[PDB]
Amino acid sequence: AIQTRTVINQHGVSETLVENFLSRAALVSKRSFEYKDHTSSTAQTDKNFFKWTINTRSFVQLRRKLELFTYLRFDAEITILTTVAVNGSNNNTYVGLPDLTLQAMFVPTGALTPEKQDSFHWQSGSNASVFFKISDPPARMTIPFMCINSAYSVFYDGFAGFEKTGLYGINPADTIGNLCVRIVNEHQPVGFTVTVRVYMKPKHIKAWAPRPPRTLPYMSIANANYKG
Amino acid sequence: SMMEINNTESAVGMERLKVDISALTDVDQLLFNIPLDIQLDGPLRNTLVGNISRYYTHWSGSLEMTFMFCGSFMATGKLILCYTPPGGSCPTTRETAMLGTHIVWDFGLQSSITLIIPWISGSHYRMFNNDAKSTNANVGYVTCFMQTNLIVPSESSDTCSLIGFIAAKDDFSLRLMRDSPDIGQIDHLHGAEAAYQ
Amino acid sequence: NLIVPSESSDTCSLIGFIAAKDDFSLRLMRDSPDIGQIDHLHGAEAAYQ
Amino acid sequence: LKLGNSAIVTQEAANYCCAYGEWPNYLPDHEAVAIDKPTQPETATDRFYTLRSVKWEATSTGWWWKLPDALNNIGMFGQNVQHHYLYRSGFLIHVQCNATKFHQGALLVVAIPEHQRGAHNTTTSPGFDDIMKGEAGGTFNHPYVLDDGTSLACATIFPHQWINLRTNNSATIVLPWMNAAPMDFPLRHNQWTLAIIPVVPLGTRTMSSMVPITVSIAPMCCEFNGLRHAITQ
């Protein structure tokens, strides 16, 4: 409980800009999908490819950073850092890590999200994809501003439609995309547990209607429910 | 932006943004003891400046902290606000509040009082080698004392309340952004693993 | 009738002042009989010592 | 005072809040790129729709009306809300309270852009019934958290006035359009959320003797989409 103070000169204003304040590539989604050779289709639509709808609410710190403002326009620079890991053992000297490539395909709104690693949506062509490898530097895609209105409603006081239930805060707009990452290679005899750690850096950031930050812990991505 | 002026832990939630002044709260009594430090528990926790500067390590500058009395129209009472510099002890009486830099705010005719604070400067320190002690700083206090008894008409409420705000001036500035520890990673949110589907 | 609210005091008080204008003037000074000679003051006969 | 509508509100001096410093306005060059036939600059819709006076007690916590949730199903605004798919309007929030000089209280009149309010201790989203309240509007079960997980102590960064009853009983927040959309559907969405939140409970020597908070809203520069379009030529 040591109490010390220092004098700070601190002649800067540009470090508190909104562009610098949200333009940090923070971890927005990460899971390890089991690519290891599936002779039997088990745990489908999540086993052999990485699917994640592009939303900033998945991780809490970065989430509370972007719901400091109501309306946001940014081109999300998506940096995809995939690290494979061989599950099991083969030998003791070197298991052999192949330079396998990945299709980090971006599936926007109105486009078919793939449901397996060998679906026909991977070869669509209309929805843009990058093909990058493990030995390559991580895939830096700067996706543009994907919203049919002019800002991302990180709060949407309303529903996606006048009917159904559970659409509060679900904009028919925003819905930035479905970041769908597979392995392009056909199944190796040895397996890899590849974790796709994708980082979003918002770029060309304009914020509107600034808000109080979130103070109690979050309970769900889709809503803003609270433990009061 | 308002502060959690009631430092009593019994008063939580709504009535911690306000302090009660009654006819039995007497003369020469410490009514609030707001410290001018950002990243420790107190009134300067869920404020705008405190929460935004919790995203940063260094937050040197000046704050513009504003109190309005929330009583009746003729709820008259002289009330002394004493601000103390970082170098000094916290005042406990009206007599030691008068010696420091202070203002006397009679809210009989003036509803909102406006305080300008010169050059508060605090930071986050990790000078210990890999200990992660999270060293804090004490760089000021704003206190309240009762110059006279608050008097009210008999038909009006005797327990007259008071709120306050805090803002910042142009010389306030932040540097070296960090992750704000207000909310930690819960890692079991109900909406999660649904975008992942 | 002087009327007041029920919460305020009914016995409301009144004071008054008096001053003078420039045309007020005095003449032919005298000894003021507000205080007479007491002739046995305690501080007296001490300057006389 | 406020004679620019079909309904007036007589009060004291205005002291308006230019909400984020800007006035309501119609579509500029954004009219050509948005949904066409937006021409109707509906002026009977600008009638000062006074909602029913919510009842300020000491035990009360707060009230809210979302701005398309309010003023729909009643009046010209409500009828054009049912007949029209999408709209744009700023709102002239006007908050009055017939509180005496002897009364005690502060009141955070705060208008919230996109008050995506959460539920209490349930992980499910709030639905049609507990979001689309209507004329009377909902009450803040937790006004300190603003029902959103945020803090009321920083609710003033939003467009706000302050009913400190010892100095003013009138609020005027002149809201702009406030949407990412140039024009948006009033059925499925709310652009604003007026929130009458007492940060001080109402104070009297009695059991917090009665004051009403009468809320009056006029949609300023209200602009719908045009049903009456010449589909020929």
Place this chain on the structure above:
Amino acid sequence: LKLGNSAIVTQEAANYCCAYGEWPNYLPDHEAVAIDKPTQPETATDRFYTLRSVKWEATSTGWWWKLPDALNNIGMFGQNVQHHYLYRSGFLIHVQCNATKFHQGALLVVAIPEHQRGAHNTTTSPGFDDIMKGEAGGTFNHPYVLDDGTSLACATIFPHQWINLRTNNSATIVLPWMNAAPMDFPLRHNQWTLAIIPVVPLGTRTMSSMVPITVSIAPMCCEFNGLRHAITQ
């Protein structure tokens, strides 16, 4: 308001009393003939020292604080009073009371040059204890006589304001130096005597419900003698 010190007092409109029509000032040509090294125009000493709020009841008679008796032993003024032999200062008397609009009372704020106050029915002089009271100050046992043998009915020829609670709750008397001496010792002497004297008792329908009289004093143009003198050359 009153932002020229390190401590401010927020209040209504000023309405100051130029005490005998004159403002405080430092030593002019009188500096050369008086005690030398008076140079210190002490500005941290000008902090608005608010005394603790004396409690106005109907049964109360009055209060007084002599101006060097007050503000000594506390703050910069008190510390320089102990470290300094002699001084000169005008005083900005500021008297506030948080009295409601419903409250009833008049209050003679009167600042007395040389209130050589007598005792009651004893021929001895008052001493150290009953003259040098301090921060809280003494109470008028006979406010009609002003404890001096004079009359309160002519106390207004002194520099004075008037807290008629129906029209003002603020007093501002801007006292000059007020001594025969150009500079005088604060330990052994008082140049002024602030006197809060109710000529009307505090009136409420209750048992004279509570108002505090908060008294705030700033030493204006306060000038001590200099300890830090270059004794060389």
Place this chain on the structure above:
Amino acid sequence: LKLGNSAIVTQEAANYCCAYGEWPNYLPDHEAVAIDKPTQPETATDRFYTLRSVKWEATSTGWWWKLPDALNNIGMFGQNVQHHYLYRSGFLIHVQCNATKFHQGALLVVAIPEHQRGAHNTTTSPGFDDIMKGEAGGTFNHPYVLDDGTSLACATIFPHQWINLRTNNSATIVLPWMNAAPMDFPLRHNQWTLAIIPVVPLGTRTMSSMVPITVSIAPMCCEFNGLRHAITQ
């Protein structure tokens, strides 16, 4: 001579050391970016604080006074050190010795920026007692190593004069502020360290007959932070 303070030191011709070639100064444009309210250019604090004369023997090794360690707890500098959080001051080191013409000795007057002095054969850091010595100051247990692991043979690159008793008995080192900080806290830190180090023991035909080394320090351009700040407006 040296008449610019409240206390003078009469001596021979000055022969000052412009320490690193520069004079003391106040805050320039650095005032706006540092901790605010630094306005006090404290001139009574500039009193020539003569420390008590340390006793030069042949068997003696040296003495040191850190410049905020000295002059604190005594005088205006000490009182403003306790009442003030942070400060800036250059120091006018003045070292005298009433040594006769017959006396023998050299004396390295050396002022050290940040004399982070180590302990002898213990790996622990020196603490409060063996760092914050005070008025009399500590003695060099190993003056050849300067208690820091450095060499006294290169101590002269620091701001230094030389009391060769056959040619001068006076030193004058005019130290600047000397900190990485524009203003720094005097309680927790020392910017300078005056070191009276005899590289020659005091020589007499007797048992090194008595000379005193009287050390006189004036804080030149001493500037604290202001407690008396107008917190209003």
